[PDB]
Amino acid sequence: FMFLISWRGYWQELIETLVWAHERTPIANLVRWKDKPVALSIVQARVVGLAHFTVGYVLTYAAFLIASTAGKFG
Amino acid sequence: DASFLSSIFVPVIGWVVPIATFSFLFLYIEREDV
Amino acid sequence: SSISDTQVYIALVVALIPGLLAWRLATELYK
Amino acid sequence: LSGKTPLFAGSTGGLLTKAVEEEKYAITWTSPKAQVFELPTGGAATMHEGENLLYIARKEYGIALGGQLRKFKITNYKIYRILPSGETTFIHPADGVFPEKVNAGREKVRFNARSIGENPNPSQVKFSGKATYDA
Amino acid sequence: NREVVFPAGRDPQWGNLETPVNASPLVKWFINNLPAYRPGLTPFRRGLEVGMAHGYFLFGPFAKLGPLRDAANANLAGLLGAIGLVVLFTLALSLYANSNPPTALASVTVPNPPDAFQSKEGWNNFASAFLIGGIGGAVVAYFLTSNLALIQGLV
Amino acid sequence: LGADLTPCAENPAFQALAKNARNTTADPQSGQKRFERYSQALCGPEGYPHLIVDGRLDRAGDFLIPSILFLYIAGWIGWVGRAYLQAIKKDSDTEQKEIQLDLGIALPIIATGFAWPAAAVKELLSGELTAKDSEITVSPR
Amino acid sequence: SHTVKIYDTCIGCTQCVRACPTDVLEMVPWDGCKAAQVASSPRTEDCVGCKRCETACPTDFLSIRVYLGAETTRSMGLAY
Amino acid sequence: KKARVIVDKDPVPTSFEKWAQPGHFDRTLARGPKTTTWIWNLHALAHDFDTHTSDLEDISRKIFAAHFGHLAVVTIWLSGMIFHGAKFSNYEAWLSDPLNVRPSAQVVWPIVGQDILNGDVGGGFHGIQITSGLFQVWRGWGITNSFQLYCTAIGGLVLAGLFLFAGWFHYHKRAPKLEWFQNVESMLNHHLQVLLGCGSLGWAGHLIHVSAPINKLMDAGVAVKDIPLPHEFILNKSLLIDLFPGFAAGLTPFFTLNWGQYADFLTFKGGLNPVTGGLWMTDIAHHHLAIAVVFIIAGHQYRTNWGIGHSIKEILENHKGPFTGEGHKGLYENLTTSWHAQLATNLAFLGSLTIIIAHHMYAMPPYPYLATDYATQLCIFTHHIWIGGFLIVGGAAHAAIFMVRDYDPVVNQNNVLDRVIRHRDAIISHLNWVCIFLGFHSFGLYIHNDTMRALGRPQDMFSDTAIQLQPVFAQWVQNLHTLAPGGTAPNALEPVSYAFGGGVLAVGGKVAMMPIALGTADFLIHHIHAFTIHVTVLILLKGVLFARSSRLIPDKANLGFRFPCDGPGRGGTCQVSGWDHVFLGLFWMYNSLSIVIFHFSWKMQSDVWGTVDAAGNVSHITGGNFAQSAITINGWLRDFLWAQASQVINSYGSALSAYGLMFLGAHFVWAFSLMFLFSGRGYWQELIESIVWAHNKLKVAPAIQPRALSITQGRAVGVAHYLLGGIATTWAFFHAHILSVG
Numbered sequence A: 001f002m003f004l005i006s007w008r009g010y011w012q013e014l015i016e017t018l019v020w021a022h023e024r025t026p027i028a029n030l031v032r033w034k035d036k037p038v039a040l041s042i043v044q045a046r047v048v049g050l051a052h053f054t055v056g057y058v059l060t061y062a063a064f065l066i067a068s069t070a071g072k073f074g
Numbered sequence B: 001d002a003s004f005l006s007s008i009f010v011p012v013i014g015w016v017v018p019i020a021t022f023s024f025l026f027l028y029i030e031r032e033d034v
Numbered sequence C: 001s002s003i004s005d006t007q008v009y010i011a012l013v014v015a016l017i018p019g020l021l022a023w024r025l026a027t028e029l030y031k
Numbered sequence D: 001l002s003g004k005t006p007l008f009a010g011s012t013g014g015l016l017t018k019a020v021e022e023e024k025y026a027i028t029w030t031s032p033k034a035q036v037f038e039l040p041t042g043g044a045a046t047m048h049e050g051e052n053l054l055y056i057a058r059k060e061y062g063i064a065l066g067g068q069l070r071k072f073k074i075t076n077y078k079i080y081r082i083l084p085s086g087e088t089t090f091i092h093p094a095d096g097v098f099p100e101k102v103n104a105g106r107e108k109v110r111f112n113a114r115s116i117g118e119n120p121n122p123s124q125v126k127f128s129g130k131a132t133y134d135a
Numbered sequence E: 001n002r003e004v005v006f007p008a009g010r011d012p013q014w015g016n017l018e019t020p021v022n023a024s025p026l027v028k029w030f031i032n033n034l035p036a037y038r039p040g041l042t043p044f045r046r047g048l049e050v051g052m053a054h055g056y057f058l059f060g061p062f063a064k065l066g067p068l069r070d071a072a073n074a075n076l077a078g079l080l081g082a083i084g085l086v087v088l089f090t091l092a093l094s095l096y097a098n099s100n101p102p103t104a105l106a107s108v109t110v111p112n113p114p115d116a117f118q119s120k121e122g123w124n125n126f127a128s129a130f131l132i133g134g135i136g137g138a139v140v141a142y143f144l145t146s147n148l149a150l151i152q153g154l155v
Numbered sequence F: 001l002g003a004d005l006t007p008c009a010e011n012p013a014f015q016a017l018a019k020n021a022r023n024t025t026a027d028p029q030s031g032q033k034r035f036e037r038y039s040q041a042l043c044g045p046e047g048y049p050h051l052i053v054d055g056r057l058d059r060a061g062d063f064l065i066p067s068i069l070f071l072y073i074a075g076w077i078g079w080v081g082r083a084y085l086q087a088i089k090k091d092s093d094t095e096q097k098e099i100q101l102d103l104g105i106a107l108p109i110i111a112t113g114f115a116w117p118a119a120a121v122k123e124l125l126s127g128e129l130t131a132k133d134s135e136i137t138v139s140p141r
Numbered sequence G: 001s002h003t004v005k006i007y008d009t010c011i012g013c014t015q016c017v018r019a020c021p022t023d024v025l026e027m028v029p030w031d032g033c034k035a036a037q038v039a040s041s042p043r044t045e046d047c048v049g050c051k052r053c054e055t056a057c058p059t060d061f062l063s064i065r066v067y068l069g070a071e072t073t074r075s076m077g078l079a080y
Numbered sequence H: 001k002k003a004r005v006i007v008d009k010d011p012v013p014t015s016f017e018k019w020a021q022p023g024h025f026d027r028t029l030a031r032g033p034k035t036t037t038w039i040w041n042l043h044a045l046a047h048d049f050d051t052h053t054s055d056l057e058d059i060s061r062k063i064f065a066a067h068f069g070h071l072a073v074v075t076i077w078l079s080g081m082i083f084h085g086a087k088f089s090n091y092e093a094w095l096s097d098p099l100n101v102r103p104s105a106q107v108v109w110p111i112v113g114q115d116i117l118n119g120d121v122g123g124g125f126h127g128i129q130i131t132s133g134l135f136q137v138w139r140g141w142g143i144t145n146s147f148q149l150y151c152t153a154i155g156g157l158v159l160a161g162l163f164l165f166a167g168w169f170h171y172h173k174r175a176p177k178l179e180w181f182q183n184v185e186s187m188l189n190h191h192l193q194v195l196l197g198c199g200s201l202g203w204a205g206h207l208i209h210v211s212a213p214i215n216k217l218m219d220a221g222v223a224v225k226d227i228p229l230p231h232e233f234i235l236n237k238s239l240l241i242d243l244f245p246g247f248a249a250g251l252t253p254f255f256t257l258n259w260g261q262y263a264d265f266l267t268f269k270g271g272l273n274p275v276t277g278g279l280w281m282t283d284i285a286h287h288h289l290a291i292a293v294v295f296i297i298a299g300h301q302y303r304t305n306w307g308i309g310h311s312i313k314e315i316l317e318n319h320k321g322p323f324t325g326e327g328h329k330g331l332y333e334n335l336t337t338s339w340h341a342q343l344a345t346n347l348a349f350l351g352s353l354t355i356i357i358a359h360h361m362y363a364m365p366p367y368p369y370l371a372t373d374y375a376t377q378l379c380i381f382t383h384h385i386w387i388g389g390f391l392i393v394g395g396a397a398h399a400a401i402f403m404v405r406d407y408d409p410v411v412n413q414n415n416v417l418d419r420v421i422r423h424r425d426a427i428i429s430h431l432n433w434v435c436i437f438l439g440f441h442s443f444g445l446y447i448h449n450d451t452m453r454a455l456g457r458p459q460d461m462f463s464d465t466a467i468q469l470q471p472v473f474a475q476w477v478q479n480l481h482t483l484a485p486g487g488t489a490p491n492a493l494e495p496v497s498y499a500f501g502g503g504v505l506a507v508g509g510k511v512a513m514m515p516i517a518l519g520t521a522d523f524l525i526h527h528i529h530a531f532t533i534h535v536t537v538l539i540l541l542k543g544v545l546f547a548r549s550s551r552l553i554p555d556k557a558n559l560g561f562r563f564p565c566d567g568p569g570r571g572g573t574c575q576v577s578g579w580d581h582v583f584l585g586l587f588w589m590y591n592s593l594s595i596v597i598f599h600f601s602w603k604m605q606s607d608v609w610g611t612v613d614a615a616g617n618v619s620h621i622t623g624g625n626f627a628q629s630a631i632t633i634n635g636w637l638r639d640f641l642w643a644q645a646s647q648v649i650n651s652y653g654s655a656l657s658a659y660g661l662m663f664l665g666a667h668f669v670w671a672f673s674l675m676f677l678f679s680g681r682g683y684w685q686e687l688i689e690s691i692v693w694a695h696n697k698l699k700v701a702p703a704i705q706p707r708a709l710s711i712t713q714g715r716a717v718g719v720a721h722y723l724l725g726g727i728a729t730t731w732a733f734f735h736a737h738i739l740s741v742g
């Protein structure tokens, strides 16, 4: 629901401050990224949110189905 | 008596395969050669 | 109960064959 | 470049490591008087009477700043692209005239001599380098 | 009564502020003589001291909070956890090194980082040193806690 | 019919529910009159009256009578709305008359709407019910 | 970069050029409309892709289109 | 300049002409609709008076008239509640037996089966049991019969009509100028003196003469009909002196400062009344006397027409320092020229105050027979915490609206607002760090506990019988509060609350209040609270500091406060507006306050509330299972949500069946929100295209053309239904559990 409800520009503005904090911190200055950190894209976020949604859907129901039947009948 | 294989394969599949796989893929996706 | 140890080792050595063949197919599909 | 940097006490919003490594931008303008404006990085600054020079991370920052310099009736603002080689190129306006006005000597770029419902189908252009919008 | 917060280098255009936390002479003393930044050190010497300190403190949470912390094998399990995590850190440093990494950044506090962290060889020397220092620091923390009863008994 | 449908008047579970009937209204015999009215339906083994909707005339009151009643009232509402929208599309500002109703136009239409089936059939046969597919907008295929 | 195209249903009302926050667009001379001007997009390397130009365009089914493409530092709008 | 009254006579004529013109107030809505977007814009812009006019004086006149309209509807609500207590209530039967009659107004009419909601609430009465605590308020007011409630409700109707007439009057007949509103020193003096201090002094007068004698005769247990009417405590002074012997001295020890004579009815007893479980009415009267004197004194600080006093501008300009530049120079012009800035401050601090009121009223129950009524104790706590959270998110919204619209860089130049703008990246990145730290070390400890308990390793949990996390600082503070009577507070007899210590106070066999012990589960849940508040603050503060600009979109304040995006470019810039931060923060406010009210409900039912044995043993409702089950997520699932929702789902065919219906209907509205949250409007507009085709086919297409909801409206509807469904779910759950077990 995080990926489905909160959309991109919030996260992009938040990651810009994390980039500032990393480039202004001492000893953590010694390393950084070869690829620039960005927020997930709009389609990517729909992908990731739907994937989470359906994995959680499947695993919740399969846990309930197996356990409720096998606690009664083995 | 082959139940000793799990104490080899599960730590391999949990640590050695991820570290080697991620190390190769990290060095590969950051390389400017291929 | 179960199968013998030698059968487990034969199954692992036989599984070396499609592992090598899958490595060759996955590298050939990459080019 | 020539100009005085506007008077403010600094911010965390300013130039980051991108300036020293790939690209930096600058806007210059001349002001009739000293007056308070709003920085694109957040905050209040004072422009000088006379020429100014304020460095910015992106070109869009200078276009937003020059958009609010229209509200002070300052219309001689110039934007420069600055590479770490010291190579300064003048980008806006690029012709010398603002792009809202037609100037001669400007050529059409990326004009399609058709309406937009007259693009080819994607299957008609499939397995080739061309897109449906390309000519 | 005067201002304490300044732009860095007297130029307000950078994303920078000289604050008391950022640019105190005591803070600038301390960060600049940490072995990451101390002048007059080879990359091996920096990695060796950084490793020694990190192995030493990383012994602690494995020994006192791990699964075996109530057994007689508690301190040795903590030593093995700290050495395994030092080895993982060394592997991460070597992958960072061999990725042709970007350069270390100067800041308000450190005006100029060492040339050790600017190329691949300085990072590889650092990581080779970090491994040795880390295993040594974890071993010295192991012997100072596991024999702490005897060391108190010598008094 | 199917799955143990006895009459309500013979079902012992219906007779057991009728003894503990709740009063629906302030009438002290709403529950008794409810079960006396429901006594002629068919009944599951739990005591509750099941409805049969296949269209037989023994059970016309289950679904056939409310079907005719709904379809008449719904055609009234829809035909009156269609007549009002068609009457206001010529009066020089149509959108303003959709949020502010002309009562002098709408109220004779809601009075006229009792005979919507005859009006709808005369609308159908004269070709005035539908617009042509070339007259109304579509999107590119 | 992104790709910004202009079609001949342009009427030269200059609104896309005013809408652009990164100076991608400009007005060039023409004879195809009453205003005698088109839009043109020479600086598409500075296109962020924000589609303000398409919002500003008044012709029914736009005379300017942005086709989003390969993302760069300028097109992602990154100040770092 | 002096504070005076200048009034325009007859600014706006009273006529029904504009009631026939919907959207007359906006110049773009006055053209009439073309699409259905117009209809929603008429409601989104109805109270946005900056879009109505650009003149601050007419904006201020509109605001001042609309306040009287709002006061009218609130007084209609309050007189309605008092009228239902007068007429449709078992209040007189409840006064005679406060421990066994359940409080009820709202008889339900007998139609389609709904008279099952008229439960046996005691006192020979059938109706819906109420949890709003009006019975206790009228009890503490000293109301003894229905006729006094009828008089109060009629007076409330008169006062509501008087407010409504005042709102007509100050917009059409006598409307104040701009400088009448900008006398903030005059308004603060009058509010602190008259609206707070004189009000609290008059209320102390009522408490001394009416509430305390009648409630003292009730606690003696006389009768409801033998207690005399309270004007017979003024006319016949001997009835006071029989109860309170300090009245025999009269008013002469007040003026001669012999105030120890008044110690019969102005006590400092500290704890609770053992008969009612409420606060002592003499403590409450003494409270209001002290508070009244302090407020009257405090309302003389500010300069008005006579030279003495303070300029608030001169106070704010002197509070600069070496870290903060010019300090608070310019903040006076922000708060005197922007109504949104004032609404931000008052909304944030009024919400914070309501959360304080909720924490205070459970632990120090003011009203007689309030603490033993566990349904009222649960419901008023959770009600005022929700009012607090909503008002705080409102204060963040109006701070961002100030920052977009009314922020002036010339006024706010090197002051504390300009300096927090210029280091907003440091603030927001450290708050990001804090939120991640608090998340890991609050929720990850629960995940550790889940996994260690599931792996059969409870010796590795963070609990009281394993690795411990004791709340040493809160335990120390509660020790200091237990030891305060006789020590640091020598003139107090009992502690302020029994929540810190002092022993079980039982009323009618049930616990009124007992010490709330704090342990590892309490440590964990307070850090859950710290985490969820800090994340909500991150979202709202980020939306206020970045309302005008970020690194991504520089000219964000040109786009407005409330806008969907700036296109799919720059990677995609969806939800960058300050409005969208209010949107995202409403969910985290919901998350935080749901965990707060769940903590409250299960901590009280497990460790405070319950029945007291005749020996003195406390037997709690859920039996002390908070200590070992509130430390995992499986425990909160099973032992709280699964176990306590047994009463809302078994509630059909009974008096609590409307709670089960609301439970399912709220799950419905909650799930129905997600269609609006997870989708976007391109789908819905394209579906409306084919439906408009089928209407164009049958000649039923409307001229007001159908549009899908705007991106902002889709988000607004989604969060409104998400909040409505989730809060109504917890409402029906709380009601049906606590009306059954407590």
Ligand code: CLA
Residues within 6 Å of the ligand: E058, E061, E062, E063, E065, E066, E067, E068, E085, H440, H441, H444, H445, H447, H448, H451, H460, H461
């Ligand atoms: C995020 C919260 C959290 C925390 C605090 C812990 C804590 C713990 N877990 Mg655990 N766990 C968690 C989440 C958490 N878990 C989750 C989410 C899972 C997934 C299911 C597990 C699964 C798990 C398993 C399977 C096991 C544990 C175990 C343990 C214990 C030993 C681990 C250890 O050696 O740490 C090693 C820690 C470090 C190497 C680093 C510690 C970090 C340091 C202290 C930070 C210091 C920062 C410092 C203040 C900054 C300095 C400033 C500078 C200027 C000086 C420890 C009590 C083991 C156990 O026996 O339980 C008792 C075990 O077997 N955990």
Ligand code: CLA
Residues within 6 Å of the ligand: F077, F078, F079, F080, F081, F082, F084, F085, F101, F106, F107, F109, F110, H690, H691, H692, H694, H695, H698, H700
């Ligand atoms: C004048 C009224 C009117 C009429 C005659 C129709 C007619 C129709 N609609 Mg419909 N519709 C209306 C209003 C109306 N619509 C309104 C106001 C909305 C927005 C809620 C819709 C939304 C809508 C959808 C989403 C769909 C239809 C569909 C359809 C078709 C199938 C029947 C159906 O599904 O009904 C269902 C209609 C509703 C549930 C809408 C509620 C009807 C309201 C309550 C009554 C309107 C009466 C009007 C306000 C009174 C004015 C009278 C005047 C004197 C003032 C049919 C052509 C379907 C279609 O295309 O299938 C081919 C379809 O999918 N309608």
Ligand code: CLA
Residues within 6 Å of the ligand: H043, H044, H045, H046, H047, H048, H049, H343, H347, H390, H391, H392, H393, H394, H395, H397, H401, H561, H562, H579, H582, H586, H720, H724
């Ligand atoms: C003292 C309280 C107070 C006041 C006076 C205002 C005043 C204002 N707010 Mg505001 N606000 C408040 C609290 C307050 N707010 C709170 C608590 C929040 C947090 C949720 C907000 C969040 C907020 C936002 C996010 C926005 C405003 C805006 C506005 C302005 C225009 C609003 C308008 O036209 O109304 C229009 C009102 C409606 C269309 C009604 C909406 C229907 C509500 C949401 C449903 C309520 C459900 C109901 C209670 C329960 C179900 C009942 C139902 C089944 C019948 C106006 C200045 C807007 C603006 O731009 O300001 C300049 C804006 O965008 N406010």
Ligand SMILES: CCCCCCCCCCCCCCCC(=O)OC[C@H](COP(=O)(O)OC[C@@H](O)CO)OC(=O)CCCCCCCCCCCCCCC
Residues within 6 Å of the ligand: H319, H320, H321, H322, H323, H324, H325, H327
């Ligand atoms: C919004 C909530 C803030 C709380 C966040 C907590 C940690 C964040 C700290 C970040 C450092 C910020 C840099 C400050 C900005 C800075 O310039 O600092 C300097 C500032 C003083 O500035 P000046 O001296 O210039 O101020 C003079 C004028 O500004 C007028 O005061 O000192 C602080 O305020 C530090 C104290 C904050 C410490 C918070 C104490 C909270 C007290 C809590 C009382 C609660 C009740 C307790 C009962 C037991």
Ligand SMILES: CC1=C(/C=C/C(C)=C/C=C/C(C)=C/C=C/C=C(C)/C=C/C=C(C)/C=C/C2=C(C)CCCC2(C)C)C(C)(C)CCC1
Residues within 6 Å of the ligand: E052, E053, E054, E056, E057, E132, E133, E134, E135, E136, E137, E139, E140
């Ligand atoms: C400053 C400060 C602080 C901090 C502190 C800390 C942070 C510390 C740390 C500490 C530590 C952390 C330490 C460490 C140490 C270490 C050591 C002591 C080590 C050693 C090692 C060694 C000696 C080894 C050797 C070896 C061996 C044995 C073997 C072989 C190898 C080798 C050679 C390596 C505080 C905050 C409090 C306060 C303020 C100030």
Ligand SMILES: CC1=C(/C=C/C(C)=C/C=C/C(C)=C/C=C/C=C(C)/C=C/C=C(C)/C=C/C2=C(C)CCCC2(C)C)C(C)(C)CCC1
Residues within 6 Å of the ligand: H079, H152, H153, H155, H156, H159, H198, H199, H201, H202, H203
């Ligand atoms: C509940 C309610 C109500 C009621 C209310 C009331 C009934 C009120 C009252 C009120 C009151 C009844 C008040 C009063 C107050 C008073 C006051 C506030 C007074 C004070 C005074 C003073 C301040 C004094 C002074 C003095 C001195 C100090 C000394 C010298 C002399 C003299 C005397 C001057 C109503 C109906 C509305 C509605 C519903 C609700």
Ligand SMILES: CC1=C(C/C=C(\C)CCC[C@H](C)CCC[C@H](C)CCCC(C)C)C(=O)c2ccccc2C1=O
Residues within 6 Å of the ligand: H675, H676, H677, H679, H680, H681, H684, H685, H707, H708, H709, H710, H711, H713, H714, H715
């Ligand atoms: C479902 C959905 C819609 C569809 C909803 C629409 C088009 C509005 C809902 C229809 C209204 C409620 C119809 C009102 C019509 C008449 C007022 C009904 C009158 C009936 C009388 C009896 C009063 C969106 O438009 C949308 C937009 C953006 C993001 C998400 C969504 C989204 O999820």
Ligand code: SF4
Residues within 6 Å of the ligand: G004, G019, G020, G021, G022, G023, G024, G025, G046, G047, G048, G049, G050, G051, G052, G053, G054, G066, H569
């Ligand atoms: S997408 Fe944006 S940057 Fe590109 S041409 Fe349009 S308005 Fe300009």
Ligand code: SF4
Residues within 6 Å of the ligand: A007, A042, H564, H565, H566, H567, H568, H569, H572, H573, H574, H575, H680, H711
């Ligand atoms: S997905 Fe929607 S809100 Fe997001 S950038 Fe696109 S149009 Fe805007």
